[PDB]
DNA sequence: CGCAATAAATGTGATCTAGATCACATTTTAGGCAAAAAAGGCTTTACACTTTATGCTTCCGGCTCGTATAATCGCACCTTATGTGAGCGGATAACAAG
């Protein structure tokens, strides 16, 4: 059961380490918060990890749902999320 | 031929320009022909294009395996309480026929 939901979980394919890299930076964020009491700035963790600081920000942009289309916005009658995007 | 009356036609003659002359010497004009500066011509050589075989290396990328671990279990507390009528099948009670 940990093999099937290990890849084909979301509606779209998702890598393995891409979801294992999130909780990796989690069990350390509160680790420095329970001691010092301040938010771990992207400077001290840049020396303990293999990620610089710039490219690591674009990684979070990938980790999403992202979002459906047939979802009410304002009119809640005929207006849909995928009905406001112009065509090229 | 004499008479009517709105338009067109008439004279004046001194003043002041407008338009024309002449023969010869000066000044302008036209197209002409090379030279210089420019257009594309049609060569022959200097270099530069991505492409694609390849294989070797380090770094970032993407995927799994087994292991170690405890469990196969437990309260008290916070705040609400959809709307209806119309259409439908099923279960139950009252009824006439045998």
UniProtKB/Swiss-Prot annotation:
Region (Sigma-70 factor domain-3): 20-88
Annotated compartments: Cytoplasm
Domain of life (superkingdom): Bacteria
Disulfide pattern: none
Comment, domains: Contains 4 domains, connected by flexible linkers. In the active conformation, the domains are in an extended conformation, each making extensive interactions with the RNA polymerase catalytic core. In the autoinhibited state, sigma-70 factor domain-1 packs closely together with sigma-70 factor domains-2 and -4, contrary to the extended conformation that is seen when the protein is part of the RNA polymerase holoenzyme.
Role noted for this protein: Sigma factors are initiation factors that promote the attachment of RNA polymerase to specific initiation sites and are then released. This sigma factor is the primary sigma factor during exponential growth. Preferentially transcribes genes associated with fast growth, such as ribosomal operons, other protein-synthesis related genes, rRNA- and tRNA-encoding genes and prfB.
Family statement drawn from the similarity comment of this UniProt entry: Belongs to the sigma-70 factor family. RpoD/SigA subfamily.
Subunit structure, as described in the record: Interacts transiently with the RNA polymerase catalytic core formed by RpoA, RpoB, RpoC and RpoZ (2 alpha, 1 beta, 1 beta' and 1 omega subunit) to form the RNA polymerase holoenzyme that can initiate transcription. Identified in a complex containing RpoD, the RNA polymerase subunits RpoA, RpoB and RpoZ, CRP and DNA. Interacts with Rsd; this prevents interaction with the RNA polymerase catalytic core and with promoter DNA, and as a consequence, promotes transcription from promoters that require alternative sigma factors.
Name of the protein in its database record: RNA polymerase sigma factor RpoD
Organism: Escherichia coli (strain K12)
């Amino acid at each position: 059961i940990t093999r099937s939901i290990a890849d084909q979980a979301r509606t779209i394919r998702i890598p393995v380490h891409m979801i294992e890299t999130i909780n990796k930076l989690n069990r350390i964020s509160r680790q420095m918060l329970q001691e010092m009491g301040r938010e771990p700035t992207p400077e001290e963790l840049a020396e303990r990890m293999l990620m610089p600081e710039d490219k690591i920000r674009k990684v979070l942009k990938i980790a999403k749902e992202p979002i459906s289309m047939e979802t009410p916005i304002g009119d809640d009658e005929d207006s849909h999320l995928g009905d406001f995007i112009e065509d090229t």
